Amino acid sequence: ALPTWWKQAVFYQVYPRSFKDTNGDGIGDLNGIIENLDYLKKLGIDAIWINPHYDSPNTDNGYDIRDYRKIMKEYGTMEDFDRLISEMKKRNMRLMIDIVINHTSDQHAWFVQSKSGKNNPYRDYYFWRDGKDGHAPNNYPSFFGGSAWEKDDKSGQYYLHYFAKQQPDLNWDNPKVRQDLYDMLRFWLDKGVSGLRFDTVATYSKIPNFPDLSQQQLKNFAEEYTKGPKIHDYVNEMNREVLSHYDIATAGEIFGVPLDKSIKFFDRRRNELNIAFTFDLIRLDRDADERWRRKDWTLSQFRKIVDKVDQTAGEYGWNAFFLDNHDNPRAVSHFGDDRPQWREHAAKALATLTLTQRATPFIYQGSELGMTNYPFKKIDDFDDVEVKGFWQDYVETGKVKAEEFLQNVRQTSRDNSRTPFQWDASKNAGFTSGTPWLKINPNYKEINSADQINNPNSVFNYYRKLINIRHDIPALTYGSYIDLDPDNNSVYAYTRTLGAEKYLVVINFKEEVMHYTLPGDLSINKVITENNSHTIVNKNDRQLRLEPWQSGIYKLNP
Ligand SMILES: [Ca+2]
Numbered sequence: 001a002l003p004t005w006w007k008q009a010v011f012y013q014v015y016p017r018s019f020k021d022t023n024g025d026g027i028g029d030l031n032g033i034i035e036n037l038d039y040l041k042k043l044g045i046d047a048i049w050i051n052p053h054y055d056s057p058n059t060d061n062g063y064d065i066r067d068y069r070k071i072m073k074e075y076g077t078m079e080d081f082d083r084l085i086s087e088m089k090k091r092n093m094r095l096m097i098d099i100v101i102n103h104t105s106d107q108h109a110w111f112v113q114s115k116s117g118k119n120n121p122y123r124d125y126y127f128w129r130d131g132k133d134g135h136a137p138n139n140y141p142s143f144f145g146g147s148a149w150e151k152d153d154k155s156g157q158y159y160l161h162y163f164a165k166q167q168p169d170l171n172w173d174n175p176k177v178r179q180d181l182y183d184m185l186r187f188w189l190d191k192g193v194s195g196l197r198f199d200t201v202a203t204y205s206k207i208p209n210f211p212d213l214s215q216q217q218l219k220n221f222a223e224e225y226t227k228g229p230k231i232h233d234y235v236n237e238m239n240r241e242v243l244s245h246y247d248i249a250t251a252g253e254i255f256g257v258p259l260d261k262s263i264k265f266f267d268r269r270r271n272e273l274n275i276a277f278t279f280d281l282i283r284l285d286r287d288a289d290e291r292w293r294r295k296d297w298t299l300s301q302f303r304k305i306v307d308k309v310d311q312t313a314g315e316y317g318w319n320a321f322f323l324d325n326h327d328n329p330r331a332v333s334h335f336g337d338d339r340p341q342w343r344e345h346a347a348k349a350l351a352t353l354t355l356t357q358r359a360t361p362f363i364y365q366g367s368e369l370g371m372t373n374y375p376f377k378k379i380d381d382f383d384d385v386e387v388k389g390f391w392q393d394y395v396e397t398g399k400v401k402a403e404e405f406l407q408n409v410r411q412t413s414r415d416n417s418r419t420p421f422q423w424d425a426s427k428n429a430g431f432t433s434g435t436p437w438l439k440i441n442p443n444y445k446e447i448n449s450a451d452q453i454n455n456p457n458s459v460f461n462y463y464r465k466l467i468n469i470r471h472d473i474p475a476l477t478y479g480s481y482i483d484l485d486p487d488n489n490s491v492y493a494y495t496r497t498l499g500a501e502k503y504l505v506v507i508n509f510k511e512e513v514m515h516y517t518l519p520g521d522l523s524i525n526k527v528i529t530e531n532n533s534h535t536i537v538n539k540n541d542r543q544l545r546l547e548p549w550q551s552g553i554y555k556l557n558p
Pocket of ligand 1: 021022023024025026027028029074
Protein backbone atom coordinates (compact mmCIF):
# COMPACT_ATOMS: atom_id res chain seq x y z
CA ALA A 1 0.00 0.00 0.00
CA LEU A 2 -1.11 2.49 -0.69
CA PRO A 3 -2.97 1.26 -3.76
CA THR A 4 -4.00 3.99 -6.21
CA TRP A 5 -5.72 3.95 -9.51
CA TRP A 6 -2.56 4.96 -11.37
CA LYS A 7 -0.37 2.27 -9.76
CA GLN A 8 -2.83 -0.42 -10.93
CA ALA A 9 -3.84 1.19 -14.28
CA VAL A 10 -2.63 -0.15 -17.61
CA PHE A 11 -1.89 2.81 -19.82
CA TYR A 12 -1.80 2.92 -23.58
CA GLN A 13 0.24 5.53 -25.40
CA VAL A 14 -1.30 7.08 -28.50
CA TYR A 15 0.99 8.99 -30.88
CA PRO A 16 -1.84 11.02 -32.49
CA ARG A 17 0.10 11.80 -35.74
CA SER A 18 0.29 8.07 -36.47
CA PHE A 19 -2.82 6.52 -34.87
CA LYS A 20 -5.77 7.09 -37.28
CA ASP A 21 -6.29 9.73 -40.02
CA THR A 22 -9.98 10.48 -40.55
CA ASN A 23 -9.77 13.21 -43.28
CA GLY A 24 -7.28 11.86 -45.89
CA ASP A 25 -4.41 14.32 -45.29
CA GLY A 26 -2.17 11.35 -44.23
CA ILE A 27 -1.78 12.52 -40.62
CA GLY A 28 -3.58 11.04 -37.61
CA ASP A 29 -6.02 13.32 -35.80
CA LEU A 30 -8.21 13.48 -32.61
CA ASN A 31 -11.29 12.21 -34.42
CA GLY A 32 -9.32 9.04 -35.30
CA ILE A 33 -8.56 8.52 -31.58
CA ILE A 34 -12.29 8.97 -30.78
CA GLU A 35 -13.44 6.49 -33.35
CA ASN A 36 -11.11 3.78 -31.98
CA LEU A 37 -11.84 4.14 -28.27
CA ASP A 38 -13.95 0.99 -28.35
CA TYR A 39 -10.97 -0.94 -29.75
CA LEU A 40 -8.83 0.26 -26.79
CA LYS A 41 -11.62 -0.52 -24.31
CA LYS A 42 -11.77 -4.06 -25.74
CA LEU A 43 -7.99 -4.42 -25.27
CA GLY A 44 -8.67 -3.65 -21.53
CA ILE A 45 -6.82 -0.21 -21.45
CA ASP A 46 -8.11 2.17 -18.72
CA ALA A 47 -5.92 5.25 -19.31
CA ILE A 48 -4.46 6.82 -22.45
CA TRP A 49 -1.45 9.11 -22.61
CA ILE A 50 -1.39 11.24 -25.77
CA ASN A 51 1.73 12.93 -27.18
CA PRO A 52 1.52 16.74 -27.58
CA HIS A 53 -1.75 17.91 -29.17
CA TYR A 54 -1.14 21.66 -29.23
CA ASP A 55 -0.56 24.27 -31.86
CA SER A 56 2.88 23.52 -33.22
CA PRO A 57 5.00 24.15 -36.39
CA ASN A 58 6.04 20.43 -35.91
CA THR A 59 9.84 20.74 -36.04
CA ASP A 60 9.66 18.02 -33.36
CA ASN A 61 6.14 16.70 -34.14
CA GLY A 62 4.25 18.56 -31.40
CA TYR A 63 7.08 19.11 -28.88
CA ASP A 64 7.74 22.64 -30.28
CA ILE A 65 4.66 24.37 -29.01
CA ARG A 66 3.59 27.64 -30.56
CA ASP A 67 0.41 28.12 -28.42
CA TYR A 68 -0.26 26.04 -25.34
CA ARG A 69 -3.97 26.80 -25.38
CA LYS A 70 -4.80 25.88 -28.99
CA ILE A 71 -5.29 22.41 -30.58
CA MET A 72 -2.69 21.46 -33.24
CA LYS A 73 -4.23 22.34 -36.66
CA GLU A 74 -3.57 18.82 -38.00
CA TYR A 75 -5.32 17.13 -35.05
CA GLY A 76 -8.62 19.11 -35.12
CA THR A 77 -10.39 21.68 -32.96
CA MET A 78 -11.02 22.33 -29.25
CA GLU A 79 -14.45 20.80 -29.78
CA ASP A 80 -12.76 17.54 -31.02
CA PHE A 81 -10.57 17.60 -27.92
CA ASP A 82 -13.54 18.16 -25.59
CA ARG A 83 -15.34 15.27 -27.35
CA LEU A 84 -12.33 13.01 -26.76
CA ILE A 85 -12.59 13.79 -23.08
CA SER A 86 -16.35 13.24 -22.97
CA GLU A 87 -16.24 9.99 -24.96
CA MET A 88 -13.42 8.71 -22.74
CA LYS A 89 -15.47 9.66 -19.69
CA LYS A 90 -18.49 7.69 -21.08
CA ARG A 91 -16.17 4.67 -21.23
CA ASN A 92 -14.51 5.24 -17.77
CA MET A 93 -11.16 5.90 -19.32
CA ARG A 94 -8.70 8.55 -18.04
CA LEU A 95 -6.62 10.93 -20.22
CA MET A 96 -3.00 11.86 -19.62
CA ILE A 97 -1.62 14.73 -21.71
CA ASP A 98 1.97 15.70 -22.48
CA ILE A 99 3.27 18.79 -20.68
CA VAL A 100 6.13 20.38 -22.57
CA ILE A 101 7.45 23.28 -20.44
CA ASN A 102 11.23 23.04 -20.71
CA HIS A 103 10.93 25.00 -23.98
CA THR A 104 8.40 26.47 -26.39
CA SER A 105 8.50 26.86 -30.20
CA ASP A 106 10.53 29.84 -31.38
CA GLN A 107 7.15 30.89 -32.90
CA HIS A 108 5.43 31.16 -29.53
CA ALA A 109 4.31 34.74 -28.60
CA TRP A 110 6.70 34.86 -25.68
CA PHE A 111 9.71 34.16 -27.81
CA VAL A 112 8.81 36.55 -30.64
CA GLN A 113 8.66 39.27 -27.97
CA SER A 114 11.71 38.04 -26.14
CA LYS A 115 13.94 38.22 -29.22
CA SER A 116 12.71 41.70 -30.28
CA GLY A 117 15.25 43.34 -27.89
CA LYS A 118 16.82 43.55 -24.46
CA ASN A 119 14.11 45.94 -23.24
CA ASN A 120 11.18 43.75 -24.06
CA PRO A 121 9.13 42.55 -21.01
CA TYR A 122 9.71 38.90 -22.25
CA ARG A 123 13.45 39.17 -22.71
CA ASP A 124 14.14 37.15 -19.57
CA TYR A 125 11.61 34.44 -20.36
CA TYR A 126 14.51 32.74 -22.28
CA PHE A 127 18.28 32.47 -21.88
CA TRP A 128 20.18 35.21 -23.79
CA ARG A 129 23.97 35.37 -23.53
CA ASP A 130 26.87 37.14 -25.29
CA GLY A 131 29.24 35.26 -27.55
CA LYS A 132 32.78 34.43 -26.46
CA ASP A 133 35.43 35.48 -29.06
CA GLY A 134 32.79 35.52 -31.85
CA HIS A 135 31.89 31.93 -30.82
CA ALA A 136 29.04 30.55 -28.74
CA PRO A 137 28.77 31.67 -25.07
CA ASN A 138 30.14 28.19 -24.16
CA ASN A 139 30.69 24.69 -25.62
CA TYR A 140 27.16 23.32 -24.85
CA PRO A 141 26.00 20.94 -27.63
CA SER A 142 22.34 20.39 -28.58
CA PHE A 143 20.64 16.98 -28.41
CA PHE A 144 19.34 17.66 -31.93
CA GLY A 145 22.61 18.75 -33.49
CA GLY A 146 25.32 21.39 -33.36
CA SER A 147 25.60 24.04 -30.64
CA ALA A 148 22.96 24.55 -27.93
CA TRP A 149 23.34 28.29 -28.66
CA GLU A 150 21.75 30.01 -31.59
CA LYS A 151 22.96 33.48 -32.66
CA ASP A 152 20.21 36.13 -33.07
CA ASP A 153 21.08 39.17 -35.37
CA LYS A 154 18.44 41.50 -33.94
CA SER A 155 20.24 41.52 -30.56
CA GLY A 156 23.72 40.15 -31.31
CA GLN A 157 23.20 37.66 -28.38
CA TYR A 158 22.70 33.84 -28.51
CA TYR A 159 19.68 32.00 -27.08
CA LEU A 160 19.86 28.61 -25.41
CA HIS A 161 18.21 25.52 -26.98
CA TYR A 162 18.97 22.06 -25.57
CA PHE A 163 16.75 20.62 -28.30
CA ALA A 164 16.10 22.06 -31.80
CA LYS A 165 16.93 25.68 -32.70
CA GLN A 166 13.18 25.99 -32.86
CA GLN A 167 12.79 24.90 -29.17
CA PRO A 168 14.24 27.81 -27.10
CA ASP A 169 14.51 26.83 -23.38
CA LEU A 170 12.23 28.66 -20.96
CA ASN A 171 13.86 30.54 -18.02
CA TRP A 172 12.50 28.85 -14.87
CA ASP A 173 14.66 31.15 -12.70
CA ASN A 174 12.17 33.89 -13.62
CA PRO A 175 9.18 33.63 -11.26
CA LYS A 176 6.91 35.25 -13.83
CA VAL A 177 7.71 32.34 -16.23
CA ARG A 178 6.71 29.73 -13.64
CA GLN A 179 3.48 31.63 -12.88
CA ASP A 180 2.52 31.76 -16.55
CA LEU A 181 3.25 28.07 -16.95
CA TYR A 182 1.13 27.28 -13.84
CA ASP A 183 -1.82 29.25 -15.24
CA MET A 184 -1.35 27.25 -18.46
CA LEU A 185 -1.52 23.93 -16.56
CA ARG A 186 -4.72 25.07 -14.73
CA PHE A 187 -6.28 25.79 -18.16
CA TRP A 188 -5.87 22.04 -19.07
CA LEU A 189 -6.46 20.61 -15.59
CA ASP A 190 -9.69 22.57 -15.38
CA LYS A 191 -10.97 20.53 -18.31
CA GLY A 192 -10.86 17.32 -16.23
CA VAL A 193 -7.69 15.73 -17.62
CA SER A 194 -6.62 12.91 -15.20
CA GLY A 195 -2.87 12.83 -15.86
CA LEU A 196 0.18 14.94 -16.82
CA ARG A 197 3.33 13.50 -18.40
CA PHE A 198 6.20 16.03 -17.94
CA ASP A 199 8.46 16.15 -20.94
CA THR A 200 12.22 16.32 -20.11
CA VAL A 201 11.28 17.35 -16.56
CA ALA A 202 14.83 17.22 -15.23
CA THR A 203 16.32 20.06 -17.40
CA TYR A 204 14.18 23.03 -16.15
CA SER A 205 16.98 24.35 -13.89
CA LYS A 206 20.01 25.69 -15.75
CA ILE A 207 23.61 25.73 -14.35
CA PRO A 208 24.54 29.11 -12.79
CA ASN A 209 26.88 31.07 -15.02
CA PHE A 210 26.90 28.46 -17.84
CA PRO A 211 30.60 27.17 -17.47
CA ASP A 212 32.09 25.13 -20.33
CA LEU A 213 31.71 21.36 -20.09
CA SER A 214 34.99 19.44 -19.65
CA GLN A 215 36.12 17.18 -22.50
CA GLN A 216 34.82 14.22 -20.57
CA GLN A 217 31.45 15.94 -19.86
CA LEU A 218 30.94 16.53 -23.63
CA LYS A 219 30.77 12.70 -24.03
CA ASN A 220 27.90 12.48 -21.61
CA PHE A 221 26.37 15.95 -21.47
CA ALA A 222 22.74 15.04 -20.83
CA GLU A 223 23.82 14.33 -17.23
CA GLU A 224 25.36 17.78 -16.81
CA TYR A 225 22.11 19.51 -17.86
CA THR A 226 20.13 17.70 -15.09
CA LYS A 227 22.48 19.03 -12.42
CA GLY A 228 20.65 22.43 -12.15
CA PRO A 229 20.55 23.50 -8.44
CA LYS A 230 16.89 24.38 -8.28
CA ILE A 231 15.23 21.49 -10.20
CA HIS A 232 13.57 20.02 -7.09
CA ASP A 233 12.60 23.46 -5.71
CA TYR A 234 10.84 24.10 -9.03
CA VAL A 235 9.10 20.69 -9.31
CA ASN A 236 7.92 20.84 -5.69
CA GLU A 237 6.81 24.42 -6.08
CA MET A 238 4.78 23.32 -9.13
CA ASN A 239 3.31 20.53 -6.97
CA ARG A 240 2.37 22.94 -4.09
CA GLU A 241 0.83 25.64 -6.30
CA VAL A 242 -0.81 23.44 -8.99
CA LEU A 243 -0.55 19.64 -8.97
CA SER A 244 -1.68 19.04 -5.37
CA HIS A 245 -4.82 21.08 -6.05
CA TYR A 246 -6.12 18.65 -8.60
CA ASP A 247 -6.82 14.89 -8.53
CA ILE A 248 -4.20 13.66 -11.11
CA ALA A 249 -1.34 11.21 -11.74
CA THR A 250 1.88 12.76 -12.92
CA ALA A 251 4.75 11.13 -14.80
CA GLY A 252 8.26 12.59 -15.31
CA GLU A 253 10.38 11.95 -18.38
CA ILE A 254 13.75 12.06 -16.57
CA PHE A 255 16.12 12.13 -19.50
CA GLY A 256 19.80 12.42 -18.56
CA VAL A 257 19.20 11.68 -14.79
CA PRO A 258 21.48 8.95 -13.31
CA LEU A 259 19.25 6.28 -11.78
CA ASP A 260 20.45 7.00 -8.26
CA LYS A 261 19.21 10.63 -8.56
CA SER A 262 15.81 9.65 -9.98
CA ILE A 263 14.06 8.94 -6.59
CA LYS A 264 13.97 12.57 -5.54
CA PHE A 265 11.47 13.28 -8.34
CA PHE A 266 9.08 10.44 -7.33
CA ASP A 267 9.42 9.68 -3.56
CA ARG A 268 5.80 10.30 -2.43
CA ARG A 269 7.08 12.03 0.67
CA ARG A 270 8.72 14.69 -1.53
CA ASN A 271 5.53 16.02 -3.12
CA GLU A 272 7.04 16.12 -6.56
CA LEU A 273 5.73 13.62 -9.22
CA ASN A 274 4.13 10.13 -9.13
CA ILE A 275 5.49 7.96 -11.87
CA ALA A 276 9.13 7.54 -13.13
CA PHE A 277 9.85 7.28 -16.90
CA THR A 278 13.47 6.08 -16.75
CA PHE A 279 15.83 5.52 -19.70
CA ASP A 280 18.08 2.87 -18.08
CA LEU A 281 16.44 -0.26 -19.51
CA ILE A 282 15.05 1.06 -22.76
CA ARG A 283 18.49 2.43 -23.85
CA LEU A 284 20.71 -0.16 -22.07
CA ASP A 285 22.42 -0.87 -25.36
CA ARG A 286 22.87 2.77 -26.50
CA ASP A 287 26.32 4.49 -26.60
CA ALA A 288 26.27 7.45 -24.09
CA ASP A 289 28.50 9.61 -26.39
CA GLU A 290 27.29 8.63 -29.87
CA ARG A 291 23.68 8.38 -28.82
CA TRP A 292 22.54 7.03 -32.25
CA ARG A 293 24.89 3.98 -31.98
CA ARG A 294 23.85 0.74 -30.43
CA LYS A 295 25.92 -2.22 -29.13
CA ASP A 296 25.34 -5.83 -28.18
CA TRP A 297 23.48 -6.45 -24.86
CA THR A 298 22.69 -9.57 -22.98
CA LEU A 299 19.74 -10.82 -20.89
CA SER A 300 21.84 -10.68 -17.69
CA GLN A 301 22.55 -6.99 -18.48
CA PHE A 302 18.86 -6.33 -19.15
CA ARG A 303 17.57 -8.09 -16.02
CA LYS A 304 20.18 -6.45 -13.73
CA ILE A 305 18.84 -3.08 -14.80
CA VAL A 306 15.16 -4.18 -14.27
CA ASP A 307 16.23 -5.13 -10.66
CA LYS A 308 18.13 -1.95 -10.00
CA VAL A 309 15.28 0.25 -11.37
CA ASP A 310 12.81 -1.71 -9.19
CA GLN A 311 15.08 -1.35 -6.10
CA THR A 312 15.56 2.39 -6.70
CA ALA A 313 11.83 3.14 -6.62
CA GLY A 314 11.86 1.06 -3.44
CA GLU A 315 9.14 1.67 -0.89
CA TYR A 316 8.25 5.32 -1.59
CA GLY A 317 8.67 5.90 -5.38
CA TRP A 318 6.90 4.27 -8.30
CA ASN A 319 7.98 3.19 -11.84
CA ALA A 320 6.35 3.25 -15.25
CA PHE A 321 7.49 0.11 -17.14
CA PHE A 322 7.72 0.12 -20.97
CA LEU A 323 9.88 -1.50 -23.61
CA ASP A 324 9.16 0.97 -26.43
CA ASN A 325 7.37 4.25 -27.10
CA HIS A 326 7.52 7.05 -29.73
CA ASP A 327 11.24 7.67 -29.01
CA ASN A 328 12.52 4.13 -29.31
CA PRO A 329 12.60 1.12 -31.63
CA ARG A 330 9.70 -1.38 -31.41
CA ALA A 331 9.98 -3.83 -28.47
CA VAL A 332 9.63 -7.05 -30.56
CA SER A 333 12.46 -5.95 -32.88
CA HIS A 334 14.71 -4.44 -30.22
CA PHE A 335 14.16 -6.86 -27.30
CA GLY A 336 12.64 -9.84 -29.11
CA ASP A 337 13.15 -11.64 -32.41
CA ASP A 338 10.99 -10.07 -35.11
CA ARG A 339 11.54 -12.80 -37.76
CA PRO A 340 8.31 -14.54 -38.93
CA GLN A 341 8.96 -17.78 -37.00
CA TRP A 342 9.37 -15.97 -33.68
CA ARG A 343 7.73 -12.58 -33.85
CA GLU A 344 4.39 -13.55 -32.28
CA HIS A 345 5.93 -15.73 -29.59
CA ALA A 346 8.45 -13.03 -28.66
CA ALA A 347 5.81 -10.30 -28.67
CA LYS A 348 3.72 -12.39 -26.26
CA ALA A 349 6.83 -13.10 -24.12
CA LEU A 350 7.53 -9.36 -23.87
CA ALA A 351 3.86 -8.59 -23.15
CA THR A 352 4.08 -11.11 -20.27
CA LEU A 353 7.21 -9.41 -18.92
CA THR A 354 5.62 -5.90 -19.21
CA LEU A 355 2.33 -6.89 -17.54
CA THR A 356 4.07 -8.57 -14.58
CA GLN A 357 6.26 -5.72 -13.33
CA ARG A 358 5.96 -3.83 -10.07
CA ALA A 359 5.15 -0.66 -12.00
CA THR A 360 2.45 1.02 -14.09
CA PRO A 361 2.78 -0.67 -17.53
CA PHE A 362 2.56 1.58 -20.62
CA ILE A 363 1.63 -0.21 -23.91
CA TYR A 364 2.67 1.86 -26.96
CA GLN A 365 0.27 1.85 -29.93
CA GLY A 366 0.73 -1.13 -32.20
CA SER A 367 2.89 -3.15 -29.77
CA GLU A 368 -0.31 -5.10 -28.93
CA LEU A 369 -0.17 -6.41 -32.52
CA GLY A 370 3.60 -7.12 -32.48
CA MET A 371 4.36 -4.29 -34.97
CA THR A 372 8.09 -4.26 -35.91
CA ASN A 373 10.84 -1.82 -36.82
CA TYR A 374 10.55 -0.37 -40.32
CA PRO A 375 13.10 -1.27 -42.98
CA PHE A 376 14.57 2.25 -43.59
CA LYS A 377 17.14 2.28 -46.42
CA LYS A 378 18.45 5.82 -47.03
CA ILE A 379 18.64 8.97 -44.84
CA ASP A 380 15.75 10.47 -46.81
CA ASP A 381 13.46 7.62 -45.67
CA PHE A 382 13.58 9.14 -42.10
CA ASP A 383 11.49 12.09 -40.96
CA ASP A 384 12.86 12.67 -37.44
CA VAL A 385 14.65 16.01 -36.82
CA GLU A 386 16.78 14.08 -34.26
CA VAL A 387 18.22 11.59 -36.76
CA LYS A 388 18.94 14.45 -39.17
CA GLY A 389 20.86 16.15 -36.34
CA PHE A 390 22.95 13.03 -35.76
CA TRP A 391 23.49 12.73 -39.54
CA GLN A 392 24.75 16.33 -39.76
CA ASP A 393 27.01 15.94 -36.64
CA TYR A 394 28.53 12.56 -37.51
CA VAL A 395 28.14 11.84 -41.24
CA GLU A 396 28.35 15.27 -42.92
CA THR A 397 31.43 16.02 -40.80
CA GLY A 398 32.97 12.78 -42.28
CA LYS A 399 33.40 11.28 -38.81
CA VAL A 400 31.25 8.18 -39.46
CA LYS A 401 30.61 6.54 -42.89
CA ALA A 402 26.99 6.96 -44.05
CA GLU A 403 26.43 3.19 -44.31
CA GLU A 404 27.70 2.41 -40.78
CA PHE A 405 25.54 5.30 -39.50
CA LEU A 406 22.47 3.84 -41.29
CA GLN A 407 23.14 0.32 -40.00
CA ASN A 408 22.85 1.78 -36.47
CA VAL A 409 19.86 4.24 -36.91
CA ARG A 410 17.92 1.57 -38.71
CA GLN A 411 18.01 -0.17 -35.28
CA THR A 412 17.85 2.92 -33.04
CA SER A 413 15.75 5.57 -34.84
CA ARG A 414 12.68 7.00 -33.10
CA ASP A 415 10.95 6.76 -36.51
CA ASN A 416 10.78 2.97 -36.09
CA SER A 417 7.82 3.45 -33.74
CA ARG A 418 6.21 6.31 -35.77
CA THR A 419 5.15 4.37 -38.86
CA PRO A 420 1.32 4.48 -39.02
CA PHE A 421 -0.71 2.03 -36.92
CA GLN A 422 -1.75 -1.00 -38.92
CA TRP A 423 -5.56 -1.21 -38.62
CA ASP A 424 -6.35 -3.77 -41.26
CA ALA A 425 -5.21 -5.38 -44.53
CA SER A 426 -6.75 -2.74 -46.87
CA LYS A 427 -4.81 -0.02 -48.72
CA ASN A 428 -2.41 1.86 -46.36
CA ALA A 429 -3.46 -0.64 -43.58
CA GLY A 430 -6.73 1.32 -43.23
CA PHE A 431 -4.78 4.13 -41.60
CA THR A 432 -5.75 6.83 -44.17
CA SER A 433 -7.69 7.28 -47.46
CA GLY A 434 -4.84 9.57 -48.58
CA THR A 435 -1.05 9.32 -48.55
CA PRO A 436 0.40 8.49 -45.10
CA TRP A 437 2.87 11.05 -43.77
CA LEU A 438 5.41 8.37 -43.08
CA LYS A 439 5.45 5.18 -45.15
CA ILE A 440 3.58 2.22 -43.67
CA ASN A 441 5.48 -0.99 -43.07
CA PRO A 442 4.75 -3.54 -45.95
CA ASN A 443 4.27 -6.18 -43.18
CA TYR A 444 0.85 -4.64 -42.49
CA LYS A 445 -0.63 -7.47 -44.64
CA GLU A 446 0.62 -9.93 -42.01
CA ILE A 447 0.40 -7.60 -38.94
CA ASN A 448 -2.89 -5.71 -38.43
CA SER A 449 -5.57 -5.23 -35.80
CA ALA A 450 -8.41 -6.70 -37.97
CA ASP A 451 -6.59 -10.01 -38.33
CA GLN A 452 -6.05 -10.25 -34.56
CA ILE A 453 -9.02 -8.86 -32.59
CA ASN A 454 -11.19 -11.97 -33.17
CA ASN A 455 -8.38 -14.62 -33.27
CA PRO A 456 -8.11 -15.99 -29.72
CA ASN A 457 -4.49 -16.95 -30.52
CA SER A 458 -3.46 -13.44 -31.52
CA VAL A 459 -0.83 -11.14 -29.94
CA PHE A 460 -3.78 -8.74 -29.38
CA ASN A 461 -5.77 -11.37 -27.48
CA TYR A 462 -2.77 -12.40 -25.47
CA TYR A 463 -2.28 -8.78 -24.26
CA ARG A 464 -6.04 -8.72 -23.46
CA LYS A 465 -5.68 -11.94 -21.49
CA LEU A 466 -2.58 -10.66 -19.56
CA ILE A 467 -4.24 -7.42 -18.65
CA ASN A 468 -7.24 -9.31 -17.15
CA ILE A 469 -4.78 -11.59 -15.34
CA ARG A 470 -2.94 -8.65 -13.88
CA HIS A 471 -6.30 -7.07 -12.74
CA ASP A 472 -7.20 -10.38 -11.04
CA ILE A 473 -3.97 -11.04 -9.16
CA PRO A 474 -2.84 -8.19 -6.85
CA ALA A 475 0.61 -9.68 -6.47
CA LEU A 476 1.27 -8.97 -10.24
CA THR A 477 0.93 -5.20 -9.48
CA TYR A 478 2.08 -4.73 -5.88
CA GLY A 479 4.06 -7.88 -5.18
CA SER A 480 7.76 -7.56 -4.37
CA TYR A 481 10.21 -8.56 -7.24
CA ILE A 482 13.06 -11.08 -6.86
CA ASP A 483 15.19 -12.17 -9.79
CA LEU A 484 15.98 -15.87 -9.32
CA ASP A 485 19.31 -15.56 -11.18
CA PRO A 486 20.59 -12.11 -12.38
CA ASP A 487 23.50 -13.80 -14.26
CA ASN A 488 21.41 -16.19 -16.39
CA ASN A 489 21.66 -15.20 -20.11
CA SER A 490 19.03 -17.64 -21.35
CA VAL A 491 16.02 -18.00 -19.03
CA TYR A 492 14.52 -14.89 -17.38
CA ALA A 493 12.77 -16.02 -14.17
CA TYR A 494 11.47 -13.88 -11.30
CA THR A 495 8.92 -13.97 -8.53
CA ARG A 496 6.21 -11.51 -7.55
CA THR A 497 5.13 -11.92 -3.85
CA LEU A 498 2.42 -10.62 -1.51
CA GLY A 499 2.58 -12.50 1.79
CA ALA A 500 1.80 -16.19 0.99
CA GLU A 501 0.77 -15.39 -2.63
CA LYS A 502 3.85 -16.10 -4.81
CA TYR A 503 3.90 -16.07 -8.62
CA LEU A 504 6.74 -17.07 -10.94
CA VAL A 505 7.29 -15.56 -14.44
CA VAL A 506 9.51 -17.56 -16.79
CA ILE A 507 10.60 -16.49 -20.23
CA ASN A 508 13.01 -18.38 -22.51
CA PHE A 509 14.98 -15.76 -24.47
CA LYS A 510 16.65 -18.51 -26.54
CA GLU A 511 15.46 -19.94 -29.84
CA GLU A 512 16.22 -23.42 -28.53
CA VAL A 513 14.57 -25.67 -25.96
CA MET A 514 15.79 -24.78 -22.47
CA HIS A 515 15.28 -27.04 -19.43
CA TYR A 516 15.01 -25.01 -16.23
CA THR A 517 14.90 -26.47 -12.69
CA LEU A 518 13.55 -24.13 -10.06
CA PRO A 519 15.80 -23.19 -7.13
CA GLY A 520 15.44 -24.24 -3.50
CA ASP A 521 12.09 -25.71 -2.64
CA LEU A 522 10.00 -23.81 -5.19
CA SER A 523 7.41 -25.85 -7.04
CA ILE A 524 4.36 -25.19 -9.14
CA ASN A 525 0.84 -24.89 -7.70
CA LYS A 526 -0.99 -23.68 -10.91
CA VAL A 527 -0.28 -22.52 -14.46
CA ILE A 528 -1.79 -19.05 -14.82
CA THR A 529 -0.96 -18.70 -18.54
CA GLU A 530 1.72 -19.88 -21.04
CA ASN A 531 2.52 -19.18 -24.65
CA ASN A 532 4.24 -21.73 -26.89
CA SER A 533 4.12 -24.48 -24.28
CA HIS A 534 4.44 -28.12 -25.35
CA THR A 535 5.29 -29.91 -22.15
CA ILE A 536 2.44 -30.02 -19.62
CA VAL A 537 2.96 -28.63 -16.13
CA ASN A 538 1.57 -30.71 -13.29
CA LYS A 539 1.04 -29.98 -9.59
CA ASN A 540 4.35 -29.83 -7.69
CA ASP A 541 6.56 -29.70 -10.83
CA ARG A 542 10.10 -28.49 -9.99
CA GLN A 543 11.29 -28.16 -13.57
CA LEU A 544 9.93 -26.66 -16.79
CA ARG A 545 10.93 -27.72 -20.29
CA LEU A 546 10.84 -24.40 -22.16
CA GLU A 547 10.15 -24.26 -25.87
CA PRO A 548 12.03 -21.53 -27.73
CA TRP A 549 10.50 -18.11 -26.84
CA GLN A 550 8.18 -19.85 -24.42
CA SER A 551 6.69 -17.53 -21.70
CA GLY A 552 4.47 -18.29 -18.71
CA ILE A 553 3.15 -17.17 -15.33
CA TYR A 554 2.77 -19.80 -12.51
CA LYS A 555 1.38 -19.75 -9.00
CA LEU A 556 4.01 -21.33 -6.65
CA ASN A 557 3.12 -23.70 -3.76
CA PRO A 558 3.32 -22.03 -0.31
CA1 LIG B 1 -5.98 13.86 -40.50
